Amino acid sequence: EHLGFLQKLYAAMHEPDGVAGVSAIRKAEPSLKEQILEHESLGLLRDATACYDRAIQLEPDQIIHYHGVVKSMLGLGQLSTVITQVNGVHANRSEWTDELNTYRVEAAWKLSQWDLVENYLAADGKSTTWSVRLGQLLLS
Amino acid sequence: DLQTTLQLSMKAIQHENVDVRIHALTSLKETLYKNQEKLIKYATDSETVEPIISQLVTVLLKGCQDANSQARLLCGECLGELGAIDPGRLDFSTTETQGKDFTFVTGVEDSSFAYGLLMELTRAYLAYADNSRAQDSAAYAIQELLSIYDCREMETNGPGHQLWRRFPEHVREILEPHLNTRYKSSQKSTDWSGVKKPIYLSKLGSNFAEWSASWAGYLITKVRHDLASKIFTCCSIMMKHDFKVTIYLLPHILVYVLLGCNQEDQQEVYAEIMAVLKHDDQHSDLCQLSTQTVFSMLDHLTQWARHKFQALKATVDYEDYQSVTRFLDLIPQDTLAVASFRSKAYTRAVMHFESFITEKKQNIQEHLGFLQKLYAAMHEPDGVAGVSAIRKAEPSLKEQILEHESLGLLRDATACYDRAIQLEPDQIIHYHGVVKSMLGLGQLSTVITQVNGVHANRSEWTDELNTYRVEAAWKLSQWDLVENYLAADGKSTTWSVRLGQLLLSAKKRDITAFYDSLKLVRAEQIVPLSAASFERGSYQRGYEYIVRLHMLCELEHSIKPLFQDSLNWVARLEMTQNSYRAKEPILALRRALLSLNKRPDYNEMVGECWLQSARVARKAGHHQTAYNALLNAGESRLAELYVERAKWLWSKGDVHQALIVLQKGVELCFPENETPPEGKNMLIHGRAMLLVGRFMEETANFESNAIMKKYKDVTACLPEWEDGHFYLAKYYDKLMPMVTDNKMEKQGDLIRYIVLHFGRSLQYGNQFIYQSMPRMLTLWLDYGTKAYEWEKAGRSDRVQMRNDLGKINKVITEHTNYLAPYQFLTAFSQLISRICHSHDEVFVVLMEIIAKVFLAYPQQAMWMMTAVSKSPMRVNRCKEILNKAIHMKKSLEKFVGDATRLTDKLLELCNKPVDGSSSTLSMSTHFKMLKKLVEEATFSEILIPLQSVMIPTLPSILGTHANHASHEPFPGHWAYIAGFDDMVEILASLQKPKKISLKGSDGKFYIMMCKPKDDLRKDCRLMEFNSLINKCLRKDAESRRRELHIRTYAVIPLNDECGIIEWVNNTAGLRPILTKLYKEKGVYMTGKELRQCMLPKSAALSEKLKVFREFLLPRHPPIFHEWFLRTFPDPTSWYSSRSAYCRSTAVMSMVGYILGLGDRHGENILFDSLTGECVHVDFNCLFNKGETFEVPEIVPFRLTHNMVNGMGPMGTEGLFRRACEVTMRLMRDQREPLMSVLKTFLHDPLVEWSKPVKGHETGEVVNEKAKTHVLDIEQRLQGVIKTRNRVTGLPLSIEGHVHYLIQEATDENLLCQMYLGWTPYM
Amino acid sequence: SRLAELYVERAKWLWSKGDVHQALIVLQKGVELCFPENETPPEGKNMLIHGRAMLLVGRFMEETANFESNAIMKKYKDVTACLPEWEDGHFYLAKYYDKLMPMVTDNKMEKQGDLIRYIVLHFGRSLQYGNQFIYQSMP
Ligand SMILES: CNCc1ccc(-c2cc(-c3nc(-c4ccc(S(=O)(=O)C(C)C)cc4)cnc3N)on2)cc1
């Protein structure tokens, strides 16, 4: 009855082994949120990108799932795709652009496009991500 | 009935009056929809669709190149209604009509040529009446054409006399209408002074009709032949009003112009041609048809040159021939290649490029880019893979992106697309690639937002990129978004956008827009079919569009009720070909359709559709999309979802996590609480229990009794399911050798249990018949043999054995009663092999089985028992079996008598000594008794023993009531022996065997060679095996897409040393084919210098290699490509036949390696003149008997340098290697049925394994090497290489095995050692 | 970018995916491209990469079943002759000799003397040049 709480604890502690244990213990079919938590904890990112798109289809107003999708695209090495994805999310929703600026700034300083890095940084003051800080240092 | 209906409708659709055709087609669509249940039964009840369905499919696929648009659309709708039957279920063999192949291959001055001229000009004379300005020339042209030749029906057999003979005398009546009526000729021409010298592409030659006329006239001026000049003058002017006979005469005009004239006239035509080819369209229709007619003329030129070469081989002739040959040589082959690629004549581009590479020695490496582009344009993945394997340099990124698109790996391709976007940002094809790959993985939301982003930064692109937004939207069921995106752009016509428009208009309930768009989409889909059907293997090549028609039919039938559905969706999906590309679009559209109208159970139906998608994508290997489908299949089928997840994990190799998930699901859904009797839930419980039992069997943890109890559990859950009984029985079979110490005396009751469960499984299905029946009969009969030997030995355990043998006999008797005769028919040859069993009670039971099968199918059975009936113990046993069969039904008395008489007279024919020498013996004079016998009216009708009527067709998994009874094996035409053609042909090739030709009841003639002094039992069993491999190749999606197939003739042994073999028409050995080409070239080696070239087997390998490399290979250059060039002149047929040769050689190379086929010398490999496909004969030396010869055979199969040459400039890479890998993969997947049949073949007591001893018991002759041969065959099927030689390694992969085999077969160090009769040099 | 390293890494990647055959094919194709037999690689890092690739080829060959021992031994000796200071060459040569010793000599120590000398010699040189395989070579 309490496996959800336990798995969220172990995911917060960053214990992937506890998440794997809770996964092995469940008799019931895992939720989709639990599958996403299981994949984020034990890195697959392909199982996870499938799950993220499935969640976006089921719950389309959560920024968390777009975070997941773009982070997975970034982990695979698809930088141009990441910039375009963030631009689309920004196209149909502007509020999310500030939270997703991290990934476009990272893809920009990894692609070595300093013009894009400059724009994306100028249009941000709230992000203290490691990605944005590294981008600011490289632009300086 | 509906069989009569379909037959008469098939003949009505093929009517000349297009209105009759249209009415027949409309009523046929109505009939197909109304009789959908009977048609689904026809298509799905056997492994092959009933013959009528095959005829209907061919007739429709042809009625769809018909000109009238309504007829095309109509056969398209009827092909959709009929379903997209798997091409492997349909049989298109019946329609290898000549068709495109008629007569008049080469014509120059013959009045066959003039008759073509005259009838084209009669089409013109009716085209004269169009409007009179064309009167002017058409009339006088026809008049002078009549004047030039005999224009009349003079009772004298005058040339033009028999051309009036030629004319369909309606047109010939037109000719006689005004025989001498000069229609006031123009008489006028404009001499070509100051004419635009680059004619094509300027003043008078800027359009196709005018350009053709102008160039044809300038050529008219140049020809110096007295006769040809006459008629070229004749129609000079109507070539103005006629583009088509301009097209007709240009080919010959150029021939005459070049057969000798001023050199700069030559150069004028040459520069004209080169300007046509060199010029680049867009750098409109004039380009197209200018190049097309230039190709016309050059084709005629090379054809005429070949005919001329033959004539001169059989002076002025030589000078003219050299003239036209030189003009042909002057045009560069690569110019023609790139011109053809521009024209989209891809096969012609391939022909020209290959001739360029070989004729003018060129390094293929410099031209690999063009070749990869050619093969990617032809949608030929094998050529792209071959170019990738040939290339030495590192692949460009574009060349990498092409290879991935063709080979079909979408993740690697997505990475490549991203890197490409980074490298070249403004190219749109790359964004196309990435969005296509996102859509393929099922990432639909990501596709929508990706296209939105591309739109945001570049708005121009999001009109080509709108296709993917619309597809993703109608797959998400987001109808608002579909509406927006569609309204945005009306330009796109891609299938996804048409489907989105259709579904959207169904959503809005707009009936008229729906039906208009439906007609438009159907027409668009039929358009490519009309081009594809002009072909060989047309159904499979156009299968994508037939699946689209299938989808459109399902769509319309599902939508109609909304507007104002009997279609069976499961049967319609099972017919389809087992591929991802075939079934996935269907299921996606089905989910959309379920969402369009929401019934109560659609949350469950959509889940079932997602699970079917999962199982389809898994079997194909798309584990990522399989997982996405599993995710989308939410619930309502929890048990099925757990079984699918278990199978997915198993396929990913993770058998442990698979077993864990499966046990979890089986406890969750079928808890120990309650017995699931709930029908479908009981079936799912049984399937899950069986899957668990299997998983256990592969996992090394579990005990034997645990697995056994799990299997018994499944057989108790579902007691009428074949799979449970089969797996139980084969597991018992596994554990029997261990449990009993491999001593059969204790194996008795275990054998009884195994036999019983094999038979039970057979009662409820035929899916494992080739593992069940052979093994059941083997175990029973061999335990009988053992019991007999013990009885004679006297041991005390032999009484135990008598008892348990009695019990096994009782089990086998009950099986005899319950099973259907065709099921034993599948093993009849084994049953007959065991007729000389020593134990008499075992023989009584065997006799019951054989007599049952004989009463059911007396024709097949009689043909299979002829040999043994004529063999002493074999004769007596077979006579007892026959007597029993006659006793059960006395009508068989007359048939058996007539068959024995016919057969022993055929035997006399085989053994009749040919009187001295003459290649012909008359039936009327030399035999006079076989003819009488067959001519009598009382003589029973004896089936012609072709392979189609000897090999049974087993019911399919779908068919409930067809199975185990009410199923007709051997469906299709049966042709009985109506009579003998008089002429008998003696053959000098195969050791003097006659060639009688039987006349069938249908009127067709079947050529049957009557070979003597050979035991064909081995060949008979081998043909059975090859036919099983043929079934397996048909069912496989990739095998069928490549059209892999083994050409199996019919071998019927009449006697221990005689037999009749079905002659394979239109074939010649590789050695005669090559020898003819070497003789034409004038480079040949008589037996003399071959003798002097041969050295003793004592000689060291180095001497042999030097002889081979320095004398035999230089004398025999590779020429086998010229056979393909001369036999298949059309580029389409040349390409089809070259690829057929590659695929067939590959299939039979792999199968021969598996079977140890040896003695593949020149004659033993025949090549079809019509299809290009390889046919192997003389299957005597099997299972590595070659290594026993005095000069052993060290090559796995035959791949000499001339064969590799025939394969093309890529060589063994490309199509040959990829067909080899497909065959190897399929033969490893089916290792267990193939190995069952092979075990039964290698232990056959009737096959003459050892030549009979000189001095002259039981008819049986045991095979000593049986165990060795079985172990070696199963090693080869596992990948294990005999060549250890102080090396221990793992089994080779399929690619590694194929590579090793090819490099062993083509190795010169091995070939030099082969006997010279094998002709390793040729 | 100045990379036969690229071919060695492709070969290792394919071998990791389990595709040992295409690994060997790509590696032998890239060894023939980057190190054509005409001109020897005598240079600095290029001799290093040549030796790395030749050893990787020998190991692929050893794993594959169709190759027989003489060719594998010759490849390993090639590696040790190209890079005599490198430890892996000697180690793998001696390991292969140790493996094929039982078969060649029928598991009889008497004929194993000469093979044993070669094996210990190359184990020892291995040790002289590195310690990476000390627990397999000294024991
Ligand atoms: C999304 N596709 C549709 C769908 C959805 C669910 C299922 C399903 C449910 C289970 C299941 N899995 C586990 C489990 C999993 C992982 C680990 S782990 O430690 O490896 C680490 C990866 C956490 C350990 C145990 C335990 N109990 C179970 N009931 O398995 N498959 C099948 C198809």
Ligand SMILES: CNCc1ccc(-c2cc(-c3nc(-c4ccc(S(=O)(=O)C(C)C)cc4)cnc3N)on2)cc1
């Ligand atoms: C060889 N020693 C024993 C032996 C002898 C014969 C057989 C045998 C024959 C056939 C068979 N042959 C052909 C065939 C053969 C050759 C040519 S040819 O153009 O080379 C020209 C030189 C004749 C053309 C056609 C067509 N259809 C068939 N069924 O099948 N098995 C088997 C074993």
